[PDB]
């Protein structure tokens, strides 16, 4: 049909570095210049960067440069900042009066290794009263994103009763945060004593363990 | 010059659903409006356009599945024909010029296609040189919720994690903040949860 193929799907570079994104349309854009570059963040709508293939949007830094030739276009981001962590999209319009987007390019900002700060939270009394028990493990502000979080209750490895959620990359310090939530009933909870969250990360010399004794 | 979508929320599969796009300071007799969408965790998808000359154009995959119309000098509609699960997405209305920088997108409105019922969250406290605390926002549907801390005064070091759909079909989320350890006996920590689909507003006291 009409396809706008955006590459790479994802890439990484350090602050001050350079990234190059290519968008390849299946046919020439309308008037040879209906082509815009967008920057998108999670909780936000996209923010324009480039219009008419190469023109810089008002308020956009000059380190964003737009280029291309008829069907192939390039967004070049030089002098990278932490704030540049986002997903970038090409947006095109075509002579049959049809718009399309590239699949997007997620940019991760590299930085020095940052070890997580680990916290464990036992369930609340209000929750225990309600008949359920959720134990929360928090990995705070770490890089890189890869981490191993395992639960041990009375030194028995849990499996299938936890769920992980990870924030976006912070635009100021380029870190991630991760939560691992263990979901039990009140009965099973009062059955045991030791609740432990074990965290393995490149920032930790050896796996860190954070534990508590139930009812203490 | 502003845009706002409306009519989003939870809808039953097969029930027609009409979204409304409201503009202010934009002349639909002289500028085009576009409908875009974005499934959770996926890319932007172009749905259609109301043109400057009254032309209405749809993506090949969107023809039949959507009907776009202008209902008033300030409103443009997107009727999603018999919604399905794959139609769950955030829907944007946008004044998206390719050759100018007068570019205005609405904040987006989430459309959830599901048979599940709406459910307000339960809010539980995650009690504590640096200390951490938070709020477990457990078992609600549909998305989304908003979490603030101390009515917006607390913003630095806050991490509100994206929701994870539980095996029960409900969502759970946590919102944490890091604070000086000295402040625990000295200051109050309160999380303000708002879940608009249920018109729920909960304030939760977090204490050691």
């Amino acid at each position: 049909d009409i396809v706008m193929t955006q590459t790479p799907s994802s890439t990484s570079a350090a602050v001050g570095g350079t990234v190059t994104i290519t968008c390849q349309a299946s046919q020439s854009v309308a008037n040879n210049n209906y082509l815009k570059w967008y920057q998108q963040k999670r909780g936000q709508p996209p923010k324009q960067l480039i219009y008419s293939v190469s023109t810089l949007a008002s308020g956009v830094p000059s380190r964003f440069k737009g280029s291309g030739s008829g069907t192939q276009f390039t967004l070049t981001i030089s002098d990278l900042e932490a704030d540049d962590a986002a997903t970038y999209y090409c947006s095109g319009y075509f002579n049959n009066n049809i718009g399309a987007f590239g699949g997007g390019t997620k940019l991760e900002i590299k930085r020095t290794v940052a070890a997580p700060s680990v916290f464990i939270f036992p369930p609340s009394d209000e929750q225990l009263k309600s008949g359920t028990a959720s134990v929360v493990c928090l990995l705070n502000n770490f890089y890189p994103r890869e981490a191993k979080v395992q639960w041990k209750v009375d030194n028995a490895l849990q499996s299938g009763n936890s769920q992980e959620s990870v924030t976006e990359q912070d635009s100021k310090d380029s870190t991630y945060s991760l939560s691992s939530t263990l979901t039990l009933s009140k009965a099973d909870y009062e059955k045991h004593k030791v609740y432990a969250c074990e965290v393995t990360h490149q920032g930790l010399s050896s796996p860190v363990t954070k534990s508590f004794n139930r009812g203490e | 010059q502003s845009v706002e979508e409306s009519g989003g929320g939870l809808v039953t599969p097969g029930t027609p659903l009409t979204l409304t796009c409201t503009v202010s300071g934009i002349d639909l007799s002289r500028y085009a409006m576009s409908w875009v969408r974005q499934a959770p965790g996926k890319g932007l998808e172009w749905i259609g356009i109301f043109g400057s000359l009254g032309g209405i154009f749809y993506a090949s995959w969107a023809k039949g599945r959507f009907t776009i119309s202008k209902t008033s000098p300030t409103t443009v509609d997107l009727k999603i024909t018999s919604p399905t699960t794959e139609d769950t997405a955030t829907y944007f209305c946008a004044r998206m010029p390719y050759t100018t920088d007068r570019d205005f997108w609405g904040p987006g409105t989430l459309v959830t296609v599901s048979s599940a019922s709406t459910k307000g969250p339960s809010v539980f406290p995650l009690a504590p040189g640096t200390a951490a605390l938070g709020c477990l926002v457990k078992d609600y549907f549909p998305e989304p919720v908003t979490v603030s801390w101390n009515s917006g005064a607390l913003t630095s070091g806050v991490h509100t994690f994206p929701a994870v759909l539980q095996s029960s079909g409900l969502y759970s989320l946590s919102s944490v903040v890091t604070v000086p350890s000295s402040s625990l006996g000295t200051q109050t920590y309160i999380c303000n949860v708002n879940h608009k689909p249920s018109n729920t507003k909960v304030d939760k006291k977090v204490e050691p």
Binding site: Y34, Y93, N97 | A32, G51, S52, G55, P97, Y98, T100
Partner: peptide, 6 residues
């Protein structure tokens, strides 16, 4: 037809 976007 003629373009209907700017």
């Amino acid at each position: 037809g003629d373009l209907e976007s700017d």
